Amino acid sequence: HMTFVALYDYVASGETDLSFKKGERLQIVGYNHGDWWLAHSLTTGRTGYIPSNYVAPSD
Amino acid sequence: HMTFVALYDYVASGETDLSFKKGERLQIVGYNHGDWWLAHSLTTGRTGYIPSNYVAPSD
Numbered sequence: 001h002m003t004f005v006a007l008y009d010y011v012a013s014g015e016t017d018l019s020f021k022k023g024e025r026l027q028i029v030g031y032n033h034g035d036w037w038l039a040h041s042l043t044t045g046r047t048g049y050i051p052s053n054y055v056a057p058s059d
Numbered sequence: 060h061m062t063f064v065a066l067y068d069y070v071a072s073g074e075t076d077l078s079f080k081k082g083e084r085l086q087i088v089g090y091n092h093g094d095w096w097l098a099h100s101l102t103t104g105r106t107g108y109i110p111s112n113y114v115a116p117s118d
Contacts, residue, residue: 002090006083012076015097018107019071025101025117026063026109035094036108038074042084048077049095049108050085058084 003042005058012048062101064117071107 020026033051040047079085092110099106 002086004085004087006079006081006085009081010077010079012078014075016073016075016107017071017095018069018098018100018105018109020065020069020100020103020105020109020113022065022068024065024103026065026098026114027061027101028063029097029099029106031061031096035096035111036076037090037094038088039077039085040088041077041079042086044079044083046077046079047088048075050077050079052094054079055085 003058004039004055006055008054010050010054015049017049062117063098063114065114067113069109069113074108076108 039050095108098109
């Protein structure tokens with residue numbers, strides 16, 4: 001219900017979410033780019049992961 | 060270089076990252092599940108997005 005506006009262009013890499021078992025050991029890739037959210041574009045109708053710092057609150 | 064251990068199993072949905080243009084309007088899907096990171100499993104060698112609260116710091 002909160003809506004956001006994209007502040008910059010972002011082109012997808014095609015990475016998907018990762019299946020993993022309890023006990024696996026993992027490392028974060030590109031930590032310096034910050035965290036991500038699953039999002040839905042009202043503009044295009046597409047859905048996928050986006051970087052948090054590319055968007056700001058919007059009407 | 061920080062390593063994490065998975066505390067729970069997670070099965071991928073197959074969602075990818077999302078391409079978007081500056082100015083698009085977006086909404087977050089499943090905000091209550093928290094944020095995500097791109098990660099690489101040392102255990103399986105696979106890479107993909109994971110939910111932050113499924114992992115803890117590890118040796």
